[PDB]
Design an enzyme around this catalytic site. Structure first.
Site, short mmCIF file in Angstrom:
data_model
loop_
_atom_site.label_atom_id
_atom_site.label_comp_id
_atom_site.label_asym_id
_atom_site.label_seq_id
_atom_site.Cartn_x
_atom_site.Cartn_y
_atom_site.Cartn_z
N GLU A 282 7.04 1.06 -1.83
CA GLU A 282 7.68 0.31 -2.82
C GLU A 282 9.18 0.18 -2.28
OE1 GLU A 282 6.98 -0.01 -6.98
OE2 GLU A 282 8.84 0.50 -7.65
N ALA B 189 0.76 -1.21 -0.22
CA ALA B 189 0.04 0.04 -0.13
C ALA B 189 1.04 1.14 0.04
CB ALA B 189 -0.93 -0.19 1.06
N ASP C 34 3.61 -9.00 10.40
CA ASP C 34 3.95 -9.62 9.15
C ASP C 34 5.04 -10.60 9.10
OD1 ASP C 34 2.93 -9.86 6.52
OD2 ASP C 34 4.63 -8.44 5.78
#
Ligand SMILES: CC(C)c1cc(Nc2nc(N3CCC[C@H](N)C3)ncc2C(N)=O)cc(C(C)C)n1
Length: 271
Positions: free
Chosen positions: A25, A22, A133
């Site tokens: 990068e 989101a 994550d």
């Protein structure tokens, strides 16, 4: 502390994209002035509208701190419309690739990997960061070397996700400890603990140490995993409790070569 750039391309040659997210990068970049390589996280400031200041204050804390087992934040560049987090490039290779490429792999190897992840995650938690994550894709080796440490390669400012997160219940740092338990499971057998109904199995923490894959794995390793893959986040081991368990701190991790079965299961269960 923040470096300023009219155009980030005056500083870096951008190469292959390492990861997308989101409005974020991570790209492989070469510093033009030195030839040194980095992993640069490119963030539009628009995506930080409202929180810009809070995120910068937190970046300002982490830029001063290097953990052995976490990607270093080397520099921060600000352009008119972007932030660039210049991160250490972790270039030693991927977690599952190493295990498959090895001829020899034991519980002690898995325990050594988990011990490093627990150290890194305990530190993030002390700094008020819940990773959320943790999975093999965020774990990369520092070097191609036999003795290379593992590193959390990226962090933010279903099969790996804690039951309380799937339940849309309140969640805490404990979700990371569940994820480390799932990674430990995969490191000892080569396949994920949950797959189908899947949602319901994770919600109920319904998994097994199935034969033959778990037959030559120590009771201590199984107990270690049971204490992390615990449905109740109140009962679940913290990183600190896990780091004191004999499988991590003691000499209960076995020295049997389990490479053949673990590597076969990694090859069969993953793309
Ligand atoms: C797996 C592959 C995409 C890869 C990743 C590399 N480094 C990093 N990768 C990433 N990402 C991709 C994985 C998931 C993660 N959320 C984002 N992030 C950071 C690094 C890093 N610090 O080097 C370095 C390299 C090589 C070029 C050394 N390859």
């Amino acid at each position: 502390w923040k470096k300023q750039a009219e155009d980030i391309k005056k500083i870096f040659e951008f190469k292959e994209t390492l990861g997308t997210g989101a409005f974020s990068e991570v790209v492989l970049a070469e510093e033009k002035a030195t030839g040194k390589l980095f992993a640069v996280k490119c963030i539009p400031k628009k995506a930080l509208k409202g929180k810009e200041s809070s995120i910068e204050n937190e970046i300002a804390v982490l830029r001063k701190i290097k953990h052995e087992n976490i990607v270093a934040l080397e520099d921060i560049y600000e352009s008119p419309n972007h932030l660039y987090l210049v991160m250490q490039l972790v270039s030693g290779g991927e977690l599952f690739d190493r295990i498959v490429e090895k001829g020899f792999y034991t519980e002690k190897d898995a325990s050594t990997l988990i011990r490093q992840v627990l150290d890194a995650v305990y530190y993030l938690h002390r700094m008020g960061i819940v990773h959320r994550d943790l999975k093999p894709e965020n774990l990369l080796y520092y070097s191609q070397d036999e003795e290379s440490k593992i590193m959390i390669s990226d962090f933010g400012l279903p099969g790996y996700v804690a039951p309380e997160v799937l339940a849309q219940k309140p969640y805490s740092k404990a979700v990371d400890c569940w994820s480390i338990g799932v990674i430990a499971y995969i490191l000892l057998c080569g396949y994920p603990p949950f797959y189908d109904k899947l949602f319901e199995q994770i919600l109920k923490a319904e998994y097994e140490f199935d034969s033959p894959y778990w037959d030559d794995i120590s009771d201590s390793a199984k107990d270690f995993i049971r204490n992390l893959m615990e449905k109740d986040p109140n009962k679940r081991y913290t990183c600190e409790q896990a780091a004191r368990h004999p499988w991590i701190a003691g000499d209960t991790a076995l020295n049997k070569n389990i490479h053949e079965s673990v590597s076969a299961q990694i090859r069969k269960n993953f793309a």
